[PDB]
Amino acid sequence: SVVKSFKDLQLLQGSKFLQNLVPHRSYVSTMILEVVKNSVHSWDHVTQGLVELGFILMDSYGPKKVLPSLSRMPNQHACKLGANILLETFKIHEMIRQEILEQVLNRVVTRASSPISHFLDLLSNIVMYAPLVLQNCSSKVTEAFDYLSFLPLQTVQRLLKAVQPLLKVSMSMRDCLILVLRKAMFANQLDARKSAVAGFLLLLKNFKVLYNSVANETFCLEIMDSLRRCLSQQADVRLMLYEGFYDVLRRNSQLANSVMQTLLSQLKQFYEPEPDLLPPLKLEACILTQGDQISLQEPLDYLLCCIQHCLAWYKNTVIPEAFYEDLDDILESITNRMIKSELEDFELDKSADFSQSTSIGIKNNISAFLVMGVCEVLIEYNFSISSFSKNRFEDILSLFMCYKKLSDILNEKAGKAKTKMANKTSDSLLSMKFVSSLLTALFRDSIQSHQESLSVLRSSNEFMRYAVNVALQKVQQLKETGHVSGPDGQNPEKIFQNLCDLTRVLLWRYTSIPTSVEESGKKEKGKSISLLCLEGLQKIFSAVQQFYQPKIQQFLRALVSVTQRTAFQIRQFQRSLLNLLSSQEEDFNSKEALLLVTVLTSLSKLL
Amino acid sequence: DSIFVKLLKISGIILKTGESQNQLAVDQIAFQKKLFQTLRRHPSYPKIIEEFVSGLESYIEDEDSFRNCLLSCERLQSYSKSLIKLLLGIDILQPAIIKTLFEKLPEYFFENKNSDEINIPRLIVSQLKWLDRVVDGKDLTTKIMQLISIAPENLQHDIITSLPEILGDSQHADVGKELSDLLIENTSLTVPILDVLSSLRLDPNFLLKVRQLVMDKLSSIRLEDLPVIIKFILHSVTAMDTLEVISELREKLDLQHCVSSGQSCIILLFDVIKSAIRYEKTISEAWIKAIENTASVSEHKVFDLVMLFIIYSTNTQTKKYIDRVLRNKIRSGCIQEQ
Secondary structure, eight states, X not given: OHHHXXXXXXXXXXXXXXXXXXXXXXXXXXHHHHHHHHTTTTOHHHHHHHHHHHHHHHHHHSOOSOOOOTTTHHHHHHHHHHHHHHHHHHHHOTTSHHHHHHHHHHHHTTOOSSOOHHHHHHHHHHHHHOSSTTTTSXXXXXXXXXXXXXXXXXXXXXXXXXXXXXXXHOHHHHHHHHHHHHHHHSOSSSHHHHHHXXXXXXXXXXXXXXXXXXXXXXXXXXXHHHHHHHTTSOHHHHHHHHHHHHHHHHHOGGGHHHHHHHHHHHHHTTBOOSSSOSSOBOOSTTEEEETTEEEEOOOHHHHHHHHHHHHHHIIIIIOOOOSHHHHHHHHHHHHHHHHSOOSTTTTBTTTBOOOXXXXXXXXXXXXXXXXXXXXXXXXXXXXXXXXXXXXXXXXXXXXXXXXXXXXXXHHHHHHHSOSOOOSSSSOOSSOHHHHHHHHIIIIIOOOHHHHHHHHHHHTOHHHHHHHHHHHHHHHHHHHHSSSOSSTTTTOHHHHHHHHHHHHHHHHHHHHTSOSOOOOSXXXXXXXXXXXXXXXXXXXXXXXXXXXXXXXHHHHHTTOOOHHHHHHHHHHHHHHHXXXXXXXXXXXXXXXXXXXXXXXXXXXXXXO | OOHHHHHHHHHTEEOOOSSSOOEESSOHHHHHHHHHHHHHHSSSHHXXXXXXXXXXXXXTTSHHHHHHHHSBOEEOOOOOOBHHHHHHTXXXXXXXXXXXXXXXXXXXXXXXXXXXXXXHHHHHHHTTTTOSOOOOHHHHHHHHHHHHHHSOHHHHHHHHHTHHHHSOSSOHHHHHHHHHHXXXXXXXXXXXXXXXXXXXXXXXXXXHHHHHHHHHTGGGSOGGGHHHHHHHHHHTOOSSSHHHHHHHHHHHOOSSSOOOOSHHHHHHHHHHHHHHHHSOTHHHHHHHHHHHTOOSOOOOOHHHHHHHHHHHHSSTTSHHHHHHHXXXXXXXXXXXXX
């Protein structure tokens, strides 16, 4: 009765012909949600069957297809009626709390193979609505903390995120999670230690207090010492720590030194602090081999990235003592020597062909990716240092030329085999904030103090096309998963502001400079910059309809109702297509036309 | 005037008289390396250590002075560790300060929450957690074993669970042996020892032996610790052993030795078992098999029926199956109205 209603409603909304005839009928959705309002008074007979209908709709119609309209959207709409039924039933019926909230949990914990996003949404909604009304049904939460070791990690992070509002107000529930995380810190399985690290970072990341206010500080220091010991475990736990340390800083400033030394000491195992020693990182120690099983430990790239982010934040925020200059000069020595390194310090391209047959090719491939990550981080550093000095941009160019040489190396060696590995398309270590700023400074900027210095970057076309490639990668990451990889890549508002800023810059480069300025080469006609900017525009417009549906007004205002703004943008795009058409080109780039009608199909859903 | 206070003053820690925390002039690593090179390049090399620790013990005779040395220092220049942890970071001092930390620990057995409500011996063992370097692993282990033997009950309950923080990843076998040998004697300390034995790095066949050992003595446990032990036993089942342990548990759990004194503990226990079967489906099937296969024994207990109604009311696949089983217990005279 509920799935049929939603089929019917989709038919009407998709067609005007049926809207003229049929007078607006109440649907089963609105009736059920009226039943739930009506049920408050005395109808307890009815309410234990609303819960069963809720969980039948969610258990039956919830996703699986990610682990079409008809299999998705009247199943998506039932599963959100289910959750609406259970959330509205949970607000006013004070006795089917410990039966919904133990039945949601019993589905989150125990399934963990089948997708359970829909229960985590419901559990977030339930908590967020009123954790004041869940201090009367709390023991059902803290019995699922004991199952936390055996869950996959993404489930643990989601389920810990979702109960955060309970952790804000309740100190007993925080001190009940600490005992479990501390107990699973040492357990013999791998996933228990990851879940401990996750829980500890999220307790450091979201909270100050965890009674004299000295012991809270020494407790944070002790946690940080346990995580410092976890730094010598496997690669993934290190990587989690390196991502986490930035957010730990940015919230709790007092842990500054305890983090930075923790990285600097960890850097100095793999750093050689003497000039005129040409491979200025010890890449041998980063790979361990025990009888032909060969694996990574300590990704140097993410470590340096965490260092550079934390150091930049230290400079910009903390100073407006005689420690960070040491790490500055270390990074500067790494840049200065990574410039005048060439390819035989890491024995690349000549002696070893990075083969995925032998252990040595594995070693060299890992080495190459590590150097690539380092070069990207030092590009971001050297950009960040000065107000557009020519010499530092020459160093940026040299670092990028090294990285691009290594990329063309890795591409030719992924040309003998296939590009089946997703480890070069694995994330760039540039923040999205940085790519926005870089493309704003590359294309738009016309301040004479920067022109002479930027002109060395602009003259490098390969650099600029790499930059827009990186922006496209960040938007594809936002589409595929919910959010992006780098720093501030889990706050939707920061991705929104950076989406607006990329939109502005790519629009300016598309409309102002036309396409028919191609004085580079005929391989760049499906790879042109004014084409890639439009492709990034298409991805942004798709993604902002999907994830930022409630903000499309204040998305467009950054470029009166939504209709006039969309009409003006459509005027730009359709003028573009008009001059593209009436030009009567025989070669006729149909790719640009396809993208133009795709963006217009995307835009016309807002009128 | 003592070598200790002079070396600490030139190292860069202001020693407070003993109310508020000790101040810091320099950073932590700077102070540590400063005192290290100071004690290195100083003449009379193998005696300045003993002079240093003799000055230390003479200084920390006082309650407030030692209490402040244990508590965390203050940055003047944003908040760091204690002087004892900083001092134990240095390898050449480590074992002497370890020894004079454990020699004066039996001074604070009966001392409990005098002035600031800061229980001292937990603060003493606080300074050994997460050591960067361990010199004397065997000696430290034997010292904590002497303490864990001789200690009061509360102190040994406290230090036993803070074991995995303290020890590295080597010396766990003899520790496991000594703790299990403590377990056979003392039944008050069953709960933290088992907690710890999974939290070390033991061989699984040691853990299964201790599990069998505690199920053997399951009747001789006080009422408050019982749901915790049953929680441990049910949390520590596989797919393969589950029925043997469940059947031992079905045969050994009585509720005629523990019956606001016993009712609360039974409530908690049934909560534990409810929450176990809710979050783990094979314990329900295991438990119907343990009652159905009891055909001969017309010693059926109360525990059999209350367990049948709980598995009925929770996971609702079992209903037809518990109707069938319970029919076959009434015809057979095995379950009766009393």
